[PDB]
RNA sequence: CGGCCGGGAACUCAAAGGAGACUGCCAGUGAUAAACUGGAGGAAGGUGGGGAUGACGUCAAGUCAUCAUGGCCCUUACGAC
């Protein structure tokens with residue numbers, strides 16, 4: 001039963017959403033003082049700067065393993081990076 | 094009325110050996126950086142101040158009168174009193 005990658009990939013493509021600007025969920029893989037690694041699972045676990053996750057008091061409410069929601073800008077950048085933005089989701093909200 | 098004189102190892106000082114200051118800490122900037130700026134502490138803060146220390150080479154630079162030395166010249170003389 002060599003399940004064809006064609007139909008498996010079709011299943012995957014209907015499983016997710018790929019368009020610029022789309023608000024998509026993600027898993028926060030790691031948190032650092034500088035950037036936060038998030039994963040929407042497209043081509044690369046992206047990294048978003050820290051201030052995008054800070055409140056008026058400059059607090060990183062977000063923790064590791066939390067499911068956050070960021071706006072995908074481009075699925076790729078020429079540098080092998082998915083580009084995600086939290087501030088865009090903030091504007092949407 | 095003078096450390097002067099008993100006296101004391103407190104203090105200056107005399108040298109000898111050590112401690113200390115390294116962006117070490119904090120904040121911001123910065124390119125997830127090197128570094129920079131500011132602040133605290135500190136006697137001292139960013140090489141703390143100063144000195145000694147002069148790479149490969151250039152100027153056929155200077156010195157045959159410090160010295161040494163290749164050559165050339167004088168030897169009753171350019172030597173010596």
Ligand SMILES: [Mg+2]
Nearest residue numbers: 131132133138
């Ligand atoms: Mg200072």
Ligand SMILES: [Mg+2]
Nearest residue numbers: 140145146147
């Ligand atoms: Mg030196």
Ligand SMILES: [Mg+2]
Nearest residue numbers: 152153154155
């Ligand atoms: Mg000459």
Ligand SMILES: [Mg+2]
Nearest residue numbers: 152154155156
């Ligand atoms: Mg000269």
Ligand SMILES: [Mg+2]
Nearest residue numbers: 154155156157
């Ligand atoms: Mg001359």
